[PDB]
Amino acid sequence: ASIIDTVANLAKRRGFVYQSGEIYGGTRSAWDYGPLGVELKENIKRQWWKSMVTAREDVVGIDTSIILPREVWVASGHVDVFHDPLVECLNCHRRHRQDHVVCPDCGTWTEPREFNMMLKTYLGPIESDEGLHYLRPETAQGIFTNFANVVTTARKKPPFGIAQTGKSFRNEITPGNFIFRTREFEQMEMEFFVEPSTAKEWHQYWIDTRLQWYVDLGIDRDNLRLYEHPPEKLSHYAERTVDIEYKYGFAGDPWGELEGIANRTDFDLSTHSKHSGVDLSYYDQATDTRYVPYVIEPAAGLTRSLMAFLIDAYSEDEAPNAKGGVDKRTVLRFDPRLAPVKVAVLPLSRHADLSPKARDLAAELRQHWNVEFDDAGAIGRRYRRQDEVGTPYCVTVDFDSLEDNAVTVRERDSMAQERISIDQVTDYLAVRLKGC
Amino acid sequence: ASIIDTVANLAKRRGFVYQSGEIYGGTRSAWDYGPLGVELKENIKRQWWKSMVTAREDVVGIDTSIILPREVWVASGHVDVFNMMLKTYLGPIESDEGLHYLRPETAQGIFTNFANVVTTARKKPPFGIAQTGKSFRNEITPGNFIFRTREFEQMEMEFFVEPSTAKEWHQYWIDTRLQWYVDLGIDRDNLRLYEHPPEKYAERTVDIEYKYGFAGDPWGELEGIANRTDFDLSTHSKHSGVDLSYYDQATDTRYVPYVIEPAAGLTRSLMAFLIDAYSEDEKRTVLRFDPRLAPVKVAVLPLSRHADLSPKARDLAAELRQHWNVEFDDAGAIGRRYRRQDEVGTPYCVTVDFDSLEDNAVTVRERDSMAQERISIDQVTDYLAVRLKGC
Ligand SMILES: Nc1ncnc2c1ncn2[C@@H]1O[C@H](COP(=O)(O)O)[C@@H](O)[C@H]1O
Ligand SMILES: Nc1ncnc2c1ncn2[C@@H]1O[C@H](COP(=O)(O)O)[C@@H](O)[C@H]1O
Ligand SMILES: [Mg+2]
Ligand SMILES: [Mg+2]
Ligand SMILES: [Zn+2]
Structure with a gap:
């Protein structure tokens, strides 16, 4: 079986994903994210928003409507060329x-x-051209149309970025492998407005920066590459485009797009100024000059990024078992900041004396992280159940804990164990989970 | 001038919100959130998810698609009794084959995955499934500001319980949810319960209402907490053919759980928190946000733009930006900058003056009191952390 099929079976079995409307007939064009999947997805989103907005003085955030005025997509050209x-x-x-x-x-x-690949809808009582709207195919236009509002309220000046996450919709004729290509997806897009003479330089910067992001969150650099869009495959809004590509493992060509980093010159602000009548140019007062900014755009896929992280994390290693033998072990080697479950609290047995301490510790930990409590079955099998979903640490409460008031922390990858007093466990985990 | 108009002006001016497609003619039926609005929104959502999913053993999360199969909305009864649903056409053929609906609520995505979640998450009633997401309704007329729009965000949780317990659980959630808004700083006096009467998929419904300040009747729905009985799981079993009941092996019994549904409005919650935090004292304009909701947690202010202060101020702002959304302001006099930050609820301001070059300390000002305290820089992050109560 291929790697993609294995990972997809694991995701379906452990509730990272379900097929939408499964009980009525699901397709690979629509997916719900189960309890682990929703956390993984939100975690990736959170790391993106930290890197792009929170940590950067030059980048601010926005959230725009899925349904914008129709004229927008006439000005962007999506009506005519999409x-x-x-x-x-x-x-x-x-x-x-x-x-x-x-x-x-x-x-x-x-x-x-x-x-035309955009999805249509009708607002108001009359299903007519007055109420025709397009479910946005990209989140970028809600940024462009607010460029001046943001310059004003946020007191910003090029170079500076506007970042956004949201749902987009494309009338995709065929469903992709697993969740790769769907009609409803989530994008993470940032438009970086720069003075034109610097665009090229800035461009490479973001191409590099984005790339390092994936590496910093655990993706093997060898599974990443850069692809230059030729002039024929360039979007109608792009002069030069570079795609980050990940080795997903498809049959045939295993490589697929992961993030598109495009130099959209001054197209977008120009066309929206022309069509709306509103001047979206920027006035540099330090020089008494006025120019339409160029735009560098890193546009990532939330769902494609989740697929990439999940595939890269999958691994099978030979781990000793309790019998004194060696089993094949399925482990998702997630970065702690992405793992959907940060800690598992595992009483050694269902014994009545272990559950009080175990439950109090689970509650204390839930104050900070998403936690999993499981007293069912043999402990080793539970360790492996957690390893299967990338849980970074397992906290075992045994009978000695009733006397020394200490528990056993087990690290997922190494399977190494360390006994630490309970009143410090939180601190321990904190330093290793690398949250804010 | 009404409070709503004042708050809306402030929200527009400081880029909490912009009208969607403003340059092409906006309406109060569509609003974008600006740099501050997005952060306040996401902070409300994050606190809801922390209270519901992360904090509770008995609640797990999910996120389901906006566009579900059409049979889902034939089974939930929305096709026949709700038409307010927005239509769209999937596939190459634009006809009634590809007709789909944009969900008017996020609940059905949960109901259809009840059995999936029971299986994968190994849950047993009483337990809940929680979700935040976009819902669409073909609202005929827009509300005050961002109160009623065609596109909105919801925070819904369905709590499945053995039927004989529902009523009790119902009350529990009613109280729990209310406390939530209070624990995040809304004045209890501006909250009230409204019991839907027997004339008004549900058996019993209680709305938490907030005193928004509308002309005439200033109260409005903020969160609905319904007891939906066994309607939803029943109807989806019958229509889908998939048994969505629960089998308790501890008692060898099988039943269709009853559902208690707290359902809040992300945008309505934002509007309520904003109106509530608004205040004027001596004159000064302050948003008394809870620290966990404030879009900007700390503002770093150099006394003047100068080669001695500014690098130290920038370095500190970066250290703080590792954890919190921060705002760096070197424009105008320091008190002007304090006022600018108070106007958008920033809990704390950090000032770097010339004394900071000698004792390596800064001046931390607490928004509400305006009290100042001089803190060593290598401790400021901890000082602020303890007071910001989350990141
Ligand atoms: N149909 C789709 N399903 C999932 N992800 C997508 C889809 N289309 C685009 N993306 C993601 O969105 C990013 C930016 O798209 P674009 O703006 O078209 O370059 C891509 O690099 C993908 O990660
Ligand atoms: N059109 C809307 N705009 C804003 N919030 C809404 C809208 N419709 C529903 N909500 C929110 O969703 C909650 C639950 O709605 P319901 O599922 O209709 O009971 C309400 O209490 C509101 O807070
Ligand atoms: Mg920022
Ligand atoms: Mg939970
Ligand atoms: Zn054929």
């Missing part, structure tokens, strides 16, 4: 992407017809 060629089979009449011959539904074509 379309792909579709060919309908002449035997089963199922439409497919032409660029992407034989039919993959029956095997037996019409002339290509352009199909």
Whole structure:
């Protein structure tokens, strides 16, 4: 079995993901995130927002509506150019992407017809062109349209960034491998407005910076690469684009896009100034000059980043068991800051004397972290159940704990154990979990 | 001038919110959150998730798609009795085949995964499933400011319980949820319970109402806490064909759990916290945010822009930005800067003066009292941490 299939089976089995509406028929085009998946996803988001907004004086945040005025997508060009060629089979009449011959539904074509990938909706009582709106295909336009508002309230000046996370929607004709390509996804996008003569320099900076981010949160550098977009595959808003690519493990070419870092020159502020009538240029008072900023844009995928982190973390190693033998052990080697469960509190047995201390310790820890309590089954099996989902530390409460008031901390990867007094455990875990 | 108008002006001016698509004509049915608004929003959401999911053994989280299968909303009864749902068309053919609905609530995503969560999370009633997410309603008319919009964020939790306990649990959550708003700094006097009467998917509903200050009747819904009986799990079993009941092996019994549903509005909660924190004293304008909600936790202020002070101030601001959202301000007189920070609820201001070059200490000013205390720099992070009560 391939690595992607293994990781997907693990995710479904342990509740990182469920198929949306599974009981009514789910597709790989729609996924719900279970109790572990939601925490993993939020953790990745939080680390992104820390790196991009909180830690940087030059970058501020925003959250804009999924449904913007239609004119926006006329000015961005998405109405006119955000379309792909579709060919309908002449035997089963199922439409497919032409660029992407034989039919993959029956095997037996019409002339290509352009199909716009944005999703439509209607606001108001009349299902008419007055109420036609597009579910945004990208979060960038809500940033561009607020560039001046932000310059004003935030008192900012180029170079500076506006960052955002949110849901986007594309009418994807076919579902991707697992969660890679879905019709509803979550993006993390930042638009960095710079004085044009510096754009190129700034560009490389962000390409490097973004790359290091993935490495800093645990992704093997060898599983990452850079790809230069050719002029033909350039977006309608881009002059130069570089993609970070991750080795996901697909059949055939195992490499796939992970984050797109684009030099969008002055396109976006220009077009929105032209269409809205509002001047979105920037006035440098230190020089008495006025220019439309260039835009460097790191746009990552939350769900693609979760898939990348989850695949890179997966590993199988030979770990000794209680019998004195050696088993194959499935471990997700997450960075502590991403792991969905930071600590597991595991009484040695269901004994009535161990549950009080174990439960009080679980509560104390829940004050700070997401915690898991499990007294079911043999302890070693529970250690492995936690290792399977990337839990960084297991805290075992045994009978000696009733006398020395100390517990056994077990580190996930090394499986090494250290006995520490309870009244210090929190502190211990804190230093090793590397939160704020 | 009403308090709502004043707060809305302040929110617009300091970039708490902007009207979505302002340059193309905005409406009160759509609002973006600016640099401060996003942070206050995310802080409210984070405190809700900490209270509900992280802190409780008996509650686990989930996040389900906005667009679910159409049969889901045929089974929940929204297609027949709710039309306020927003439609969209998936796939290459724009017809009733691809017709889907944008969820008007986040609950059905939970109900349909009840059995999945019981299985993977190894949970047994009483336990809850919590979710935050975007919901859409084709609201005909927009509300005051950001109170009623077509697109909003919800914080819903469904607590599944053995039926004979529901009523008790119901009251519990009613009280619990209320305390939450109070523990985060809303005045108890501005909160009240409103019992839905028998005439008004549910059996019994209590709304926590906040005194927003509307013209006329200044009260409004802030959070609804309903007892939905066994309606939802029942209907999804029947329509899907999948048994969503629970089997207790301790008693060898099988039942359809009853559901207690606290459901709060992220945007309504933001509007309530903002209106409540607003205040004027001597004159000064202050948002008395709880530290955990304040969009900016600390502002670093050099006495003057100067080669001796500014580097020390910048270094300190970075150290603090490791943990909290910080604001660095070197413009204008120090008291002007204090006023600017008080206006947006910043709990603490740190000033670097010339004395700081000699005793390596700074001046920490507590927003509400305005009391100042001189703290060594190598301790400021701990000093602030103890007082900010989260990061
Ligand atoms: N259909 C999709 N499903 C999941 N992630 C996506 C999808 N489309 C785009 N992304 C992510 O969004 C990022 C930016 O997209 P773009 O703005 O189109 O370059 C990509 O690098 C992906 O990580
Ligand atoms: N259109 C809306 N705008 C803002 N908040 C809303 C809206 N609809 C519902 N809510 C919030 O969601 C909570 C639960 O709603 P419900 O599921 O309708 O009981 C309410 O108490 C509100 O706080
Ligand atoms: Mg920042
Ligand atoms: Mg929990
Ligand atoms: Zn065919």
